[PDB]
From TrEMBL, chains A, B:
SUPFAM superfamilies: Phosphoglycerate mutase-like (SSF53254)
Domain of life: Eukaryota
Binding-site list for substrate: 8-15, 57
GO molecular function: phosphatase activity
GO CC term (a single one): cytosol
Protein name: Phosphoglycerate mutase family protein, putative
Record-linked PROSITE patterns: PG_MUTASE (PS00175)
InterPro entries recorded: His_Pase_superF_clade-1, His_PPase_superfam, PG/BPGM_mutase_AS, PGM_Phosphatase
Sequence intervals crossing the membrane: none
PANTHER family in alphabetical order: BROAD-SPECIFICITY PHOSPHATASE YOR283W-RELATED, PHOSPHATASE C1620.13-RELATED
SMART domains named in the record: PGAM
């Protein structure tokens, strides 16, 4: 009866350009607002409580989804910091030794020079979501957040290795869901985007 | 772009009952037929080639999806044999030492007494899919098959360990998709069921 619904925020201009956002706070494009309205009509108020990253691309997506419910801001749902990667394209990072390790799995896949990795984030974010699921036991819970944050959460919840991150692709307003069996998370959908036109 | 689309067959009466099907060939329910039409309407003919398991629950689902396109039968796409487990619910198997192993990971997770495992089927199914994808390079490929077969496929394609099988749940007419970034599979969706009314 506990269902966790992770939803990636709608499109921003930097998503169009393939520029890494991290801690930047870029606004939705008009199309991303529409993606938000699209996912909102799909979810049609079929959830008990909704949480969001406070960054605007997420919050505005959440406010579209929420209907008559309050969006609860969660600081720990903000996007993963990407350090000096922010503002770059992944193509521009080929020289960077950290970027090699992010691909290969060394040091658990560092996010630039942030001192954090896919591995450490997996565990941290999975733990936040587990505590949320305990607080909201037997509810359907929507969390609106970011690409990197959601993918590390997936890995941490299912206890996958960090280079599995590069084998999941998550789109704007992609829907990802979990249920619990014997208290253990089970993935019931990943990046569902059929609501878009 | 090479795109692989894996779709589980529609509902069967045994799926409603939780009875394990394996090599049985139970027909679709009327609601299963309706699921198949709804997934066909979602896919809207947007693929180059469709393949199917020859078991009727799959073939009929595939024919609704296919429209005018020819369905290609692939023997290797038939459901995984479940041995003595066929006809039982998972609750009925709690005495069986092989069922304990299937859940724990011992011997790569055996399918009852068939001498094959989640581990062996993962490798075999991934190989079959990678061959069909090399053979239909730059095409969009639909394969209509079964829950267990598709789950082992995902595991083999993503190089995941056998107990991960229990962390994925796939529904009737659930859509799962892969792309290839230079021959390496990337999961772009799992168990999308939004097309279901």
């Amino acid at each position: 009866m506990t269902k966790l619904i992770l939803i990636r925020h709608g499109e921003t201009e930097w998503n169009l350009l393939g520029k890494i956002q991290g801690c930047t706070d870029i606004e939705l494009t008009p199309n991303g607002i529409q993606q938000a309205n699209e996912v909102a009509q799909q979810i049609k108020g079929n959830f008990d409580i909704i949480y969001s990253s406070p960054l605007h691309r997420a919050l505005i997506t959440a406010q579209k989804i929420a209907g008559d419910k309050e969006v609860h801001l969660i600081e720990g749902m903000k996007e993963i910091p990407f350090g000096t990667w922010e503002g770059h394209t992944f193509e521009e990072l080929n020289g960077d030794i950290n970027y090699k390790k992010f691909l290969s799995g060394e040091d658990g896949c560092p996010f630039d020079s942030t001192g954090m990795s896919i591995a450490s984030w997996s565990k941290k974010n999975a733990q936040l979501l587990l505590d949320l699921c305990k607080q909201n036991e037997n509810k359907t819970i929507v969390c609106v957040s970011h690409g990197a944050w959601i993918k590390t959460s997936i890995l941490g919840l299912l206890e996958m290795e960090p280079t599995m991150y590069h084998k999941f692709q998550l789109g704007n307003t992609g829907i990802t869901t979990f249920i619990f069996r014997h208290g253990h998370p089970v993935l019931t959908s990943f990046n569902s985007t059929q609501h878009l036109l």
